[PDB]
């Protein structure tokens, strides 16, 4: 979520990196909007999205998924999502 | 036999790995006197022919060159061939190999060649040892080739007529232009190089003229040959095994829509290059 | 098919001789001769595990 | 060891989502065997592919 | 499948059979709908492609013609395309077959000629076979392309996303301008053909303009396309396929080994590609 808060879960899955399908995809890929390189090396990126014209969120992805030149710094983002990502990376 | 001037180039050192790459050019023979690899390394140009057409089988095609200067290059970077006043600034002599520096100096025919290099080696073991023989012998051979290329006097190879001209009318028609002065100052070797490279936009046949381009490709500067045009923007420059991880996904086992690329490749595809036109030629009986 | 081998000219190798010898010394103690019989027997049993 | 072992071997096959790493491993094994029989570098028919028999019925 | 509008040629009667048919390119898809055979047959040009790398293997790519006209020709001899005013006298349609004539009259919207032709067909057995529906199917194809083109294409590009100027950059080239205004007069089909056959002098990509050539080879014309330089003598045409003169004052050299020495080196093709106009694209 961009800003909203979850409710009503009764059970959780532990994150594991193997969940993150590295889609080998196809040589030509192009994407638009602000993009944030989570890792140059692992081809990991975050992208703005909005469901139902009203649900701001960011989409993680891992794959070719090339983009416009307009690469943006993660430094700029909100502390809330930043801390969330900081845990979820689990560089541990 | 070898004929590239730069194929001579070897020097005393602990080095056992001299890298002279000189192309088949050296055993070809058409008055370039230097291999394309040196034309690349120092002059960012490629050798060519204009297919001069003839209705007769005797097409009598002609020599040409085209430059490789990038569109981003500026000023000195766009200078193709400096003048004596500029080459020493343009090229890092000290990084360049000693003998190569000397060769450049002598091609400019500057006294500074002997003023500096011929004295400064005194301390060197190479100056003391037999390799001084090799050094000054290569010097002698180079001077020989230079004098061969020298046109200036009747007691020599060259004789009789010359008719090429340059400095053709500026659009804004600023009077004249020393470019001929530069031409004369430049060693006849360099003049022959210019003759090899530079097409005229017009050929005045004896009693007839033909024209081949709208507008000039090149301009000349007292500081050196300029990769530039008088007007508008610079033209677009035509751009230039172990195991690996990047092994492809499976995809459609199909060729799919190649109509466009196939028909385009069936059409002829443009030779996107930069022929050097600058000047004017005449003929008479 | 499930992938595309680019399948052109490729061979991997590495050259850190000192590294490799360090590895060797790390490997040295193990009575591989004795041990690998277990893996051989594993493959054998697998021969029947293959099917029921 | 060169092949970007961010994971132990066991993990690789215990996963099924990937095929890429598995294919690469198989290929390199074949290469090693071939070379050990032929003390001479080889690259052969430059079109080869793999499929995983992911089910007992196969 | 075949699409050259001249490949769509049909005969109402048993005599003629057009037995020099369309080039294979008629089955291709450039959206020109003309075989290059016909392109030579009627206009004296040959089509070509330019690849342009986007700093990658990926490219935008463009199609361009060369003209096929000599240095000595003048006036009508230099005309490549007419005005609606003068296609008649340019072509001598009467010498052309009635199907050709009527097709031209379609292009030029000549209702009067259409009416005359239909009024002649009224009594013909080709009309008894209602073969006119061949013409009407040609029309259906054309009109569908026009509803995809004439209000579309440039007219749909009235939107900022794109503009071409065909006017000469050099205002001193007085012959430009007014012709770039006249451009509006011609059928959008013709406009599409010309524009997708003539290189711009510049492209505005808001990234960076590029200048493809020093100076335009061609110029807009008061009636229709003419093979002419903006100024000066015409550049040497690479001419290729009575007691008259054939004089060519060759150079004297008998040397031939130089040719074998030089074959290894760039042999610049001599064609006359068509450059003119300022092109613009958003983004
Ligand atoms: Zn050489
Ligand atoms: Zn046709």
Contact flag B243-C2 (C-beta cutoff 8 Å) = no
Q: Whole-angstrom Cα distance, residue E139 to residue E5?
A: 10
Q: Where are the beta strands (DSSP E) in chain E?
A: 45-53, 59-67, 162-165, 202-205, 209-211, 266-267, 278-281
Residue pair B41/B30 in contact by the 8 Å Cβ criterion:
no
Q: Do the bridges between strand B45-50 and strand E45-53 make them parallel or antiparallel, or are there none, so unpaired?
A: unpaired
Contact flag C9-D43 (C-beta cutoff 8 Å) = yes
Task: Give me the residue label for tokens 């004052």.
Answer: E249
Experimental method: cryo-EM
Q: Whole-angstrom Cα distance, residue B60 to residue B203?
A: 14
Residue pair D22/D13 in contact by the 8 Å Cβ criterion:
yes
Q: Exposed, middle or buried: residue E257 (CB in 10 Å: 0-12, 13-18, 19+)? A: exposed
> How many CB contacts within 8 angstroms connect chain A with chain D?
6
How far the first Cα of chain E sits from its last, in Å, is 36
Q: Which two tokens stand for residue B56?
A: 């007769």
Q: Whole-angstrom Cα distance, residue A69 to residue E55?
A: 13
* d(CA B94, ligand 1 centre) in Å: 21
Residue pair E271/E66 in contact by the 8 Å Cβ criterion:
yes
* d(CA B184, ligand 1 centre) in Å: 26
Q: Radius of gyration over alpha carbons of chain E, in Å?
A: 22
**CA A85, chain centre distance (Å):** 9
How far the first Cα of chain C sits from its last, in Å, is 28
How many beta carbons lie within 10 A of that of residue E148, not counting itself?
14
Contacts of C12 in chain B (CB under 8 A): 242-243
Q: Which chains touch E (3 or more CB pairs under 8 A)?
A: B
Resolution, expressed in angstroms to one decimal:
4.7
Pick from B62, B59, B50, B25: nearest CA to B40? B25
Q: In terms of DSSP H, where are the helices of chain B?
A: 36-43, 84-90, 98-107, 112-120, 125-128, 131-149, 179-185, 188-197, 259-266
Q: Whole-angstrom Cα distance, residue E53 to residue B236?
A: 12
- Residue E10, SS3? coil
- Residue B76, SS3? helix
Q: Exposed, middle or buried: residue B115 (CB in 10 Å: 0-12, 13-18, 19+)? A: exposed
Q: Which two tokens stand for residue A66?
A: 């090339």
In sequence order, the β-bridge partners of residue C3 are B249
Q: Which two tokens stand for residue B65?
A: 């060159």
Q: Whole-angstrom Cα distance, residue E72 to residue E54?
A: 40
Q: Whole-angstrom Cα distance, residue E218 to residue E173?
A: 11
Residue pair E90/E82 in contact by the 8 Å Cβ criterion:
yes
What CA–CA distances, in Å, run from A84 to A2, A14, A38, A72, B241? Answer: 11, 14, 13, 19, 43
Residue pair E218/E176 in contact by the 8 Å Cβ criterion:
no
Q: Is residue B81 within a helix (H) or strand (E), and if so which, with residue range? A: strand B79-82
- Residue B72, SS3? coil
Instruction: Count CA atoms closer than 13 A to B153's CA, side-chain side.
Output: 4
Tell me if there are at least 3 CB pairs under 8 Å linking chains D and E.
Answer: no
Q: Whole-angstrom Cα distance, residue E92 to residue E107?
A: 16
Phi-psi region of E243 (alpha: psi -120 to 50; beta: other; left: phi over 0): left
Phi, psi angles (nearest 5°) of residue E150? -65, -55
What contacts B205, CB < 8 A, 6 or more positions away?
B283, E249
Most distant CA pair in chain B: distance in Å?
Answer: 75
- Residue E89, SS3? helix
Residues in chain B after which the backbone breaks (C–N beyond 2.5 Å): 240
Q: Is B252 on the interface with C (CB under 8 A)?
A: no
In sequence order, the β-bridge partners of residue B48 are B64, E266
Task: Give me the residue label for tokens 């006849």.
Answer: B188
**Measured torsion, CA atoms of residues E101, E104, E109, E112, in degrees rounded to the nearest 10:** -10
Q: What's the gap in Å between the CA of C15 and the closest CA on chain B?
A: 13
What contacts E167, CB < 8 A, 6 or more positions away?
E176, E177, E179, E180, E220, E277, E278
What contacts E52, CB < 8 A, 6 or more positions away?
E59, E60, E61, E62
Q: Which of B250, B251, B256 to mutate to test the interface with A (most CBs of A within 10 A)?
A: B251
Written as one string, the DSSP assignment of B118-183 is HHHGGGSHHHHSTHHHHHHHHHHHHHHHHHHH--S-SSSS--S----B-----TT-----THHHHH
Residue E16 per-residue DSSP state: -
What CA–CA distances, in Å, run from E63 to B260, E160, E194? Answer: 11, 23, 10
**CA E230, chain centre distance (Å):** 18
Long-range CB contacts for residues B107-115, cutoff 8 Å, separation at least 24: B107/B146, B107/B187, B107/B189, B107/B190, B108/B84, B108/B187, B109/B187, B110/B84
* d(CA E24, ligand 2 centre) in Å: 9
Nearest CA in chain E to B270: E50
How many beta carbons lie within 10 A of that of residue A87, not counting itself?
10
Task: Give me the residue label for tokens 């290099």.
Answer: B117
Let me know how long chain E is: 283
In sequence order, the β-bridge partners of residue B47 are B65
CA angle (B30, B35, B36) in 5-degree steps: 105
Contacts with D, C 4-43, CB within 8 Å: 4-5, 7-12, 14
Q: Where are the beta strands (DSSP E) in E68-131?
A: none
Q: What's the gap in Å between the CA of C13 and the closest CA on chain B?
A: 8
Q: Whole-angstrom Cα distance, residue B102 to residue B135?
A: 11
Pick from E268, E180, E189, E254: nearest CA to E216? E180
In sequence order, the β-bridge partners of residue B81 are B225
Q: Starting at the earlier edge strand, list the strands of the sheet with E45-53.
A: B268-269, E45-53, E59-67
Nearest CA in chain C to B242: C10
Q: Is E208 on the interface with B (CB under 8 A)?
A: no
Pick from E52, E22, E69: nearest CA to E227? E69
What CA–CA distances, in Å, run from A86 to A75, A81, B64? Answer: 12, 8, 62
Q: Whole-angstrom Cα distance, residue B21 to residue B103?
A: 18
What CA–CA distances, in Å, run from A25 to B248, B255, E101, E109? Answer: 9, 17, 54, 51
> How many CB contacts within 8 angstroms connect chain B with chain D?
9
């Amino acid at each position: 979520l961009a800003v909203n808060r979850l409710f009503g879960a009764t059970e959780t899955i532990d994150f594991h990196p193997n969940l993150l399908v590295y889609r080998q995809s196809s040589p030509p890929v192009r994407l638009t909007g602000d993009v944030y390189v989570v890792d140059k090396n692992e081809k990991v990126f975050l992208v703005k999205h909005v469901f139902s014209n009203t649900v701001p969120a960011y989409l993680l992805i891992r794959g070719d998924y090339e983009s416009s030149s307009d690469l943006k710094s993660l430094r700029d983002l909100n502390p809330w999502v930043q801390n969330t990502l900081l845990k979820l990376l689990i560089p541990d | 036999v070898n004929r590239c001037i730069f194929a001579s180039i070897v020097s005393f050192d602990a080095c056992i790995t001299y890298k002279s790459p000189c192309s088949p050019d050296a055993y070809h023979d058409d008055g370039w006197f230097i291999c394309n690899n040196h034309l690349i390394k120092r002059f960012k140009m490629s050798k060519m022919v204009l297919p001069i057409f003839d209705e007769d089988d005797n097409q009598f095609k002609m020599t040409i060159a085209r430059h490789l200067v990038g569109n981003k290059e500026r000023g000195i970077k766009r200078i193709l061939i400096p003048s004596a006043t500029n080459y020493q600034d343009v090229f890092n002599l000290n990084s360049m190999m000693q003998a190569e520096q000397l060769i450049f100096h002598l091609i400019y025919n500057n006294e500074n060649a002997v003023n500096t290099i011929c004295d400064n080696l005194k301390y060197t073991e190479g100056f003391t040892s037999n390799t001084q023989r090799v050094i000054h012998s290569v010097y002698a051979t180079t001077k020989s080739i230079l004098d061969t290329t020298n046109p200036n006097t009747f007691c020599s190879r060259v004789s009789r007529d010359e008719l090429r001209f340059f400095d053709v009318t500026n659009a804004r028609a600023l009077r004249g232009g020393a470019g001929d002065q530069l031409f004369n100052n430049y060693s006849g070797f360099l003049q022959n190089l210019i003759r090899r490279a530079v097409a005229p936009e017009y050929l005045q046949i004896d009693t007839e003229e033909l024209r081949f381009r709208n507008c000039a490709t090149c301009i000349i500067d007292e500081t050196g040959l300029v990769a530039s045009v008088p007007d508008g923007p610079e033209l677009y420059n035509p751009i230039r095994q172990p195991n690996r991880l990047q092994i492809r996904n499976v995809l459609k086992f199909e060729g799919d829509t190649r109509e466009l690329d196939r028909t385009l490749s069936g059409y002829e595809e443009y030779p996107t290059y930069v022929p050097l036109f600058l000047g004017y030629q005449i003929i008479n009986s | 098919p499930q992938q595309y081998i680019n399948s052109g000219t490729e061979i991997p190798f590495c050259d850190d001789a000192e590294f490799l010898n360090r590895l060797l010394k790390h490997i040295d103690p193990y009575p591989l001769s004795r041990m690998y019989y277990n893996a051989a027997n594993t493959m054998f049993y697998t021969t029947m595990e293959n099917y029921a | 060891s060169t092949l970007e072992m961010t994971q132990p071997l066991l993990e690789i096959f215990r996963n099924k989502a990937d095929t890429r790493q598995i294919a690469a491993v198989v290929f390199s094994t074949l290469a090693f065997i071939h070379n050990r029989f032929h003390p001479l570098v080889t690259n052969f028919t430059n079109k080869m592919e793999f499929v995983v028999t992911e089910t007992n019925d196969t």
